[PDB]
């Protein structure tokens, strides 16, 4: 049949890509950084403990100021905290109690959030009146929203339960581009520092790189073991890291088109709910289901330290723009800040 | 100086605290439920607020959004080849690392698919209603025993199952969920003081 030939052309082309990847393969990052000394045993003290939530926290996001952070809880609240003084600057009630993602535009003006409801609610902060009402409700997605990020005060990119990732327009309120072709529910995404390309991780053990201007995926990294839950860009616009439900972090490179390092011990059997880098890209922080998060050496594949202060599973983790502290939110309705 | 703006921030914090306290009172004063097998359905039962949520428009894959329902009082699970899928669905939800502390309520809405229905005997402790033949009653009890074998296989997380029958009108089913929810809440309190 002609369909079998189509499948034949696919498997033979995949083999060619795999051969090309193995052809450009050389001494990996493992043995060329042997002379580099280890980062050394570092400690991470819990400076603050942002309490006040009721249900489990699911997402968080810093701001350009690197002192105000927004968090979302399943109890139907969206609280914007002041990390320096630990004061709730705002507390927005959500029309839907189930929220799984919250974003903070890079202007301290708008705040997006989504969850089981396919609608993505964007709230305005600098409102003329005291109340902070709903500025816009983006609708059209056919699946639960898993992660949304702000490109600017006019555009917003969101991920949904459906494979389609859509780039919206807050002014017109209609989808401008619909990235598709993942075959799985996109769990999260990561915006490059240059805001030209962005990667996305789904539950098919693959990561796709999409250009915001066009709708075609540039590359496809499939070297994981199970569904990818978290993904973050390296702070240089040339690499990124991913995490799946196998306690295995993978550091992929854009130009190499293959994995560089795998971070996994032999005494931990858990998932990876969050992934983030430091300001210099040397410390790779990743949360697990073992009630604590770890920090690995991005160039030595060695465990730099362990941050264990939570009483439940860590669900969100984020580093500031300037990398002064680390905010981690777990399912115990407690959001801590490590520095 | 910074003193004025600090009290304005402090007064704002005190305002959120005053609001969050009342929000916590109404939140803890109500219970949330899940119906599977998002549309909201709220109703009161003897001055007890219930918030039943039904997942809608979501894809078939449920290994991710089902985790958001960890802190739920009870997960109502209805059933209908046609049943073996539901059997495995309950089996997969029962011994899950995240839903191990969440109980499940069963609302049960043939010989070809299951061969055990041949040499199976009706339990002597049954309560057969004399309005129907023993054929259907033996069928419901067989499905009940099958679901129980899947339930009591592993109770590590210590979560219970409540099998019920759809023998009455909906207004009577609400009373059932109310009694089951009360039982689950009481058992939790009993284990919170280390009595059971």
């Amino acid at each position: 049949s002609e369909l079998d030939q189509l499948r034949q052309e696919a498997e033979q082309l995949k083999n060619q890509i795999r051969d090309a990847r193995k052809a450009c393969a050389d001494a990996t990052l493992s043995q060329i950084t042997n002379n580099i000394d280890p980062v050394g045993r570092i400690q991470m003290r819990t400076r603050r403990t942002l309490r006040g939530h009721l249900a489990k926290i699911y997402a968080m996001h810093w701001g350009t100021d690197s002192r105000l952070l927004v968090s979302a809880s399943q109890d139907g609240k969206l609280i914007i905290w002041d990390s320096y003084t630990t004061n709730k600057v705002h507390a927005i009630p959500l029309r839907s109690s189930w929220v799984m993602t919250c974003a903070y535009a890079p202007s301290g003006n708008y705040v997006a959030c989504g969850g089981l409801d396919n609608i993505c609610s964007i709230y305005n902060l600098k409102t003329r009146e005291g109340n902070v009402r709903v500025s816009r409700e983006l609708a059209g997605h056919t699946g639960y929203l898993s992660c949304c990020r702000f490109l600017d005060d006019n555009q917003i990119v969101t991920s949904s339960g459906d494979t389609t990732c859509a780039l919206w327009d807050i002014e017109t309120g209609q989808q401008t581009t619909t990235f598709t072709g993942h075959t799985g529910d996109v769990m999260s995404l990561s915006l490059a520092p240059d805001t030209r390309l962005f990667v996305s991780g789904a539950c098919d053990a693959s990561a796709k790189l999409w250009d915001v201007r066009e709708g075609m995926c540039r590359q496809t990294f499939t070297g994981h073991e199970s569904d990818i839950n978290a993904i973050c860009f390296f702070p240089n616009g040339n690499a990124f890291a991913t995490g799946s439900d196998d306690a295995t972090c993978r550091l992929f490179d854009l130009r190499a088109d293959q994995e560089l390092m795998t971070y996994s011990h032999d005494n931990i059997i858990c998932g990876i709910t969050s992934v983030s880098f430091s300001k210099s890209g040397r410390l790779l922080l990743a949360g697990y289901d073992d009630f604590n998060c770890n920090v690995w050496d991005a160039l030595k594949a060695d465990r730099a330290g362990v941050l264990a202060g939570h009483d439940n599973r860590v669900s969100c983790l984020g580093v500031t723009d300037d990398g002064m502290a680390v905010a981690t939110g777990s399912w115990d309705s407690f959001l801590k800040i490590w520095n | 100086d910074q003193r004025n703006e600090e009290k304005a921030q402090r007064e704002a914090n005190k305002k959120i605290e005053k609001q969050l306290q009342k929000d916590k009172q109404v939140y803890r004063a109500t219970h949330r439920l899940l119906l599977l097998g998002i549309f909201e359905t709220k109703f009161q039962v003897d001055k007890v607020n219930f918030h039943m949520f039904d997942v809608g428009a979501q894809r078939d894959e449920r290994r991710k959004w089902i985790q958001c329902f960890n802190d739920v009082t009870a997960i109502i699970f209805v059933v209908a080849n046609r049943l073996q899928a539901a059997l495995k669905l309950f089996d997969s939800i029962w011994n899950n690392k995240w839903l191990r502390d969440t109980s499940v309520i069963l609302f049960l809405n043939i010989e070809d698919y299951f061969p055990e229905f041949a040499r199976y005997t009706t339990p002597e402790d049954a309560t057969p209603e004399p309005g129907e033949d023993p054929r259907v009653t033996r069928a419901k009890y067989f499905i009940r025993d099958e679901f129980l074998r899947i339930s009591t296989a592993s109770g590590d997380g210590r979560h219970y199952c409540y099998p019920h029958f759809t023998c009455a009108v909906d207004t009577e089913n609400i009373r059932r969920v109310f009694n089951d929810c009360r039982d689950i809440i009481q058992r939790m309190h009993l284990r919170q003081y280390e009595l059971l």
Partner: nanobody
Framework: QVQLQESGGGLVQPGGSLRLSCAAS????????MNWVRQAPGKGLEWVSD????????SYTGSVKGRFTISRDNAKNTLYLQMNSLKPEDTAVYYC?????????????????????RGQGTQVTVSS
């Protein structure tokens, strides 16, 4: 790249036997519980059998209780399903499914319409 390539199938008269080996590659084998799911012509996906990591609690569906038998090999990364006393109604596309979570006794979406961890197995005809 996780992929599951299987063999066997074809046409066999009713009451015969058949052996399908699902060669799993691209992932560690002795960490997930492999399952078998079929899709009859004109019907949806259904669960047939399963097996643990090493194999201690093997389960089958009522329709195949006692007829089929499932076995795996962690050394060769293979998954076999021997058939005995076929039935004319057993014709279907038998897929090879891998549960998403390792070290877990449960797994969802095994019978979902779309599943990235499926082997796209061949059609197996039982008729005359």
């Amino acid at each position: 790249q996780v992929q599951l390539q299987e063999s066997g199938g074809g046409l066999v008269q009713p009451g015969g036997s058949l052996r399908l080996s699902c060669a799993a590659s691209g992932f560690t084998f002795s960490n997930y519980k492999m399952n078998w799911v079929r899709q009859a012509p004109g019907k949806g996906l259904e669960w047939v059998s399963d097996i643990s990591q090493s194999g201690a609690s093997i389960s089958y569906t009522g329709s195949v209780k006692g007829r089929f038998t499932i076995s795996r090999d962690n050394a060769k990364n293979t998954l076999y399903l021997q058939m005995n006393s076929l039935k004319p109604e057993d014709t279907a596309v038998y897929y090879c499914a891998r549960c998403p979570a390792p070290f877990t006794r449960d797994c969802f979406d095994v019978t979902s319409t779309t599943y990235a961890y499926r082997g796209q197995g061949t059609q197996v005809t039982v008729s005359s």
